[PDB]
Amino acid sequence: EFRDDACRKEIQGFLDCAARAQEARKMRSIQETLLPNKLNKLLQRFPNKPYLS
């Protein structure tokens, strides 16, 4: 009947898991930040030459 008093354990688990989800979002963002930018820099350094020179 939605009485949290006797659902305390499950509610605490849910809250802790949500906090862990936010923490995981933060850590994943910082970890994401080879990167496409660096790889494009490398490819620019060594470009494909489909023509003559």
Add this chain to the structure above:
Amino acid sequence: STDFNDKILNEPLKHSDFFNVKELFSVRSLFDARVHLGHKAGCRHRFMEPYIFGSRLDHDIIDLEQTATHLQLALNFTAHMAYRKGIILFISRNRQFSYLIENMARDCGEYAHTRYFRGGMLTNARLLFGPTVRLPDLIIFLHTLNNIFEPHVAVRDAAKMNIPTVGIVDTNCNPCLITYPVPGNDDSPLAVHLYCRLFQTAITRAKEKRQQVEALYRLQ
């Protein structure tokens, strides 16, 4: 003025090797410096085939006999220009040798441009530098390719502006527009050092001989 010019400028033009550049090198010295090593056969350029001796295990070997002849011609031209007091500009985008080439230019009293060649340095020179600027009388390419394996735009611009170009052309280079190509290895430090030393020595010899001839003429 007439006799001075006749005996100073035109006198050396009557001799096959007035500055004696052939003594500055031998095929053995070029070999020891590894001037004969080119790129893989896949990187080869169609216009560099006449100068390639062969292919040793998919690695091109530059004919050092042709290199010796071409280097003789290029060094003689450079010596004559330095004697005539023309501006000699050394161009190279090989960052491994930028510092060395700049030092060689400073020591020999000539100029160097080893940095990012901004568009118009030669074709737009009057606007960029000033209407009375004096463009180089000779451009010496220690590496005719830029840093993306394309010909240095200075080659095309020098051809446009009618500035003769000496140039070390590897097996993957395009010697079509280089006035004096010197087929050789432009990637080995030994080869680059030999080229720098040769051009420095030739230019210094030419300048000192110019001073000596001027003194001889003016003292009489």
